[PDB]
Ligand binder design. Structure first.
Ligand SMILES: N[C@@H](CC(=O)O)C(=O)O
Ligand SMILES: N[C@@H](CC(=O)O)C(=O)O
Ligand SMILES: N[C@@H](CC(=O)O)C(=O)O
Ligand SMILES: N[C@@H](CC(=O)O)C(=O)O
Lengths: 321, 308, 308, 321
């Protein structure tokens, strides 16, 4: 049986409340909770941090990537237990920075461990299956939830409470898990892991990138505040195909001319923010995010900014990764 | 044949755009008025006020309304009108994903189907409607789901009201939440709305956007939360402060479907916060601005979030 | 606390299966009866008749019903009950995608949420319901969408009625089509139903299935059509014959969402055919069997397809 | 500009009615209808047949595959105009039998050419874009509809009237088309085209394979009728995960023992009909269809039957193609 390391970070997978009914709510304990894991793997757990993923942050990301990269040779695969709220952000960061070519699988739960029909046990089982499968390697960093293997780039949470929330809403899943076996029919084409130039091994921190939302009568104050604090990048959560309210547009145009990287994404939950629509990016020094949602576009923008501040180079990164 | 008024506001879709679909004459007597002409990314409170007042004033002059509008913020305008319109004649919003000069432009048939909807007596008393891609959608739940797809508009939590085939609608649903003349929001004498901003949550979220709104003395802030409406620690600290300091706080979610619930990880009562339910952040803004015309009490705001 | 009766029929989910969720005692007084014990792939007309009669008889003895049932044909049974049940107390169907012995079994919480639904006074007068994966779904539109996913059950055309969170339901919709005591189907004295078969369309489709049904003198045939209810040429020839010869013909579709419409490629009137609307083939069967208890006239059958 | 051949077969793309409003309803004419095609390709049209796709049949399939295979060297790509009703069946047949390694793209329309906001013109444009793109080769046979490139295996029609009906409901699309450009992020892993052993070049007909539906109180008469006519194969459209009503089960078990190939699929619109569920396939001589829906499982079963009648070999084909 393969050796699989679980790196725990917290999340509802590790949460609990006073009741198995009511909605209000350690890695050794999790493992003992799923004894069946011994049928499939030799499991070792490490608790890396213990936070709700609503409090996920750059340092946790750097700590995870460096640890995976450092421990690659000591294990056959990793499982990361993580909250659902920002799982899609961490998974993409790891998909761009991990250089290990063993599976890295993220997993969480939508119901607390203490609740009736808790999804965490079987999710964890399925994540270990995935991390153990030789066919899971070279697919990038993965998320496994509700019997489905999802690529770290496209995966996002679609519903606030549904156990089936995680979907790759633009390009679909990679494989489905039945009876402990995966039929893989897809692999992401965008470059990942050892095919990216991002190397976080020596980094102590990440460039500052903020996100602003667009809607009717949007205030420019959020954007101005990021500009005044000297943010390296700003991502716009645009309306429709990446459009901005005028006041927001004017602040971001000015910023871009002072060297602030500006990426247009969309608050719309699927589809690409495209070039050659209503915004002349080349003219303003803006970058179109493609299918990257605003939180995901931030991940790439941060990493882009460790290599270049040039908008045209940043656009090329947004076309390749 | 019914009398239908088209109010144009702009968008990728008013005499010329009428004339172009001569089949409209088969189903209605159409009169066109240009209210404003803007990309719907520049939609604002003033346009909203103008529209509600115009429909409310002109209600007995016509048998229904069609509003042509850009796709980007259609779901915001529809819900604003849904809460402020007192006319119980059909009000139908329509736009287009493809330019009118493009191959297979969606605008013409969309306009046709919107007029079909506005002229159907069965469409009345269903609140403000959005008609796109052969489907009638309620103004509260409707939202744009893809950046380019002609099928983008969906009612992602509770589904459509009816589908349009061969110029007829089989309606099987109507919105239970109170709308139009069952709301107390009356905008007939207002010239501005309360100031409500939206801030985004994500890993390592800056508190600076939320701080800038609080420093400007905004009347409300809506959080586009992570998961079930949760807040990055910095953001939560700054909002905890706002809520006790004169700024109403509504937790919504950046997640595209499902409710931001009470009784999850956030003690709303302790902090003075309101849970948005199924209202996404831009929708929650609409209802929060209108709640703030009536009250500033977070308990009363939460009750409004529970009924409209 | 309400009195709730659980009727068990089998499935991958009645004293033992009760006792296993001791939290039920927090919300209801539950009484259990085993009606039959089968895999729902073997569901049949007799079980359906038994259930309708039992609910209709026992209606004043309890405050609501929960039917435990396999997933495979749940959507057929729910719609049959939806049309034949005259009790206006909640009737809620529930099953499980995963075995009760499996890791993260869905059955326990599903049962809990079904009892929550059956006990809610707001659930009454909404027709027969299916409660799965935190969602209340109307018996007419509900269907199983994936072969293994715990989230399989969806109302794919008109959406759910309500979502269940923390033991409470926010209902925002109710089915407009007539159900339960607004139907004329009365099954209280019947011991069998009319014979209705389903045939599939695809390229190079054999007419032999349809012929074998016609040769047996079936009372109806439902076509699982291609696209908008269309028929392979051989199949159309044989059905054209059936419809004039004593066998009612309903065009449905193998396509998983959307209506089989009138006024498309098939002259329904000329052939004596009925268009199913949104009813998929197994659902159309249910309504056709029940129409055939009242009439054999294709015009009257089409009217029934337009109201229920 | 590339040379692109359009092979027309009919469909609503080539339909019409008396009105642009009402719902009731040649390849040279189609082409002249989309003058913009000259900006992207040198288009030549051939009318192969002219039928509604509800009347699609084995001979049309054999004629198409042999013509593509024969004309491969005379053109840079094919577009096939086809009705929507059975497009998903023809596309899979072609995905298994075409040996040409130039793009083969299928296209149709949901609204008639004569109707307001007719989808056919832009769909045809987008299909030619796709057939012209060098990156579209080696992806198998494709369907292009509503700005989306879909693989012939997973693609199916999901709605009776919606222009956006075509989706790859299990594994997602291959790429999206904006402004005449495709960003491809996926390719099907199942073996297709020149990687399959199916060779239809000399075939005059195809093995007989019928489909039976399962529901409550299902009659066994449909199945018995296929059995009595000596059908080479039967596909079951099962309930839930491929289950059968008892009467249907007994007839198909008996058949299988007389050498009839029996494949279990599902009437459920997504997800695999799996092995190791409630049916012991190895015991009855049955084959599980996987993600293949009943009409798609028929396509593969027909072709399987040109090579073998052995259930275990047929199962292996159902695991590879
Ligand atoms: N707030 C939790 C949500 C979950 O895990 O379900 C987290 O992200 O840590
Ligand atoms: N930017 C346009 C988008 C569209 O209508 O397609 C608008 O909202 O006006
Ligand atoms: N075959 C089972 C499927 C399930 O319930 O999961 C049944 O319908 O009884
Ligand atoms: N019956 C038509 C449907 C369409 O093309 O839209 C066909 O398949 O030929």
């Amino acid at each position: 049986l393969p050796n699989i390391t679980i790196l725990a970070t917290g999340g509802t997978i590790a949460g609990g409340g006073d009741s198995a009914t009511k909605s209000n709510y350690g890695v050794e304990n999790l493992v003992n909770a799923v004894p069946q894991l011994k049928d499939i793997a030799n499991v070792k757990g490490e608790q890396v941090v213990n936070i709700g993923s609503q409090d996920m942050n750059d340092n946790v990301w750097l700590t995870l990537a460096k640890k995976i990269n450092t421990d690659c040779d000591k294990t056959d695969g990793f499982v990361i237990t993580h909250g659902v709220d920002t799982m899609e952000e961490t998974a993409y960061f790891l998909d761009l920075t991990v250089k290990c070519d063993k599976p890295v699988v993220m997993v969480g739960a939508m119901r607390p461990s203490t609740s009736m029909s808790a999804d965490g046990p079987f999710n964890l089982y399925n994540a270990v299956v995935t991390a153990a499968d030789k066919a899971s390697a070279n697919r990038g960093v993965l998320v496994v939830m509700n019997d489905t293997v999802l690529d770290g780039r496209d995966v996002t949470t679609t519903n606030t409470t549904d156990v089936a929330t995680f979907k790759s809403v633009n390009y679909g899943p990679l494989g489905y898990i039945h009876n402990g076996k995966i039929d893989y029919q897809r692999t992401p084409a965008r470059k990942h892991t050892s095919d990216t130039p991002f190397d976080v091994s020596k980094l102590n921190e990440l460039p500052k990138v903020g996100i602003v939302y667009n809607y009717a009568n949007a205030s420019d104050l959020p954007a101005k505040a990021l500009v005044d604090a000297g943010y390296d990048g700003i991502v716009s959560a645009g309306v429709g195909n990446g459009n901005l309210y005028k006041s927001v547009f004017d602040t971001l145009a000015t910023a871009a001319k002072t060297g602030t990287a500006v990426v247009r994404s969309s608050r719309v939950p699927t589809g690409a923010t495209t070039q050659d629509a209503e915004v002349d990016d080349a003219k303003y020094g803006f970058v179109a995010s493609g299918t990257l949602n605003p939180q995901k576009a931030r991940v790439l923008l941060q990493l882009a900014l460790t290599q270049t501040k040039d908008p045209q180079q940043i656009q090329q990164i947004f076309n390749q990764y």
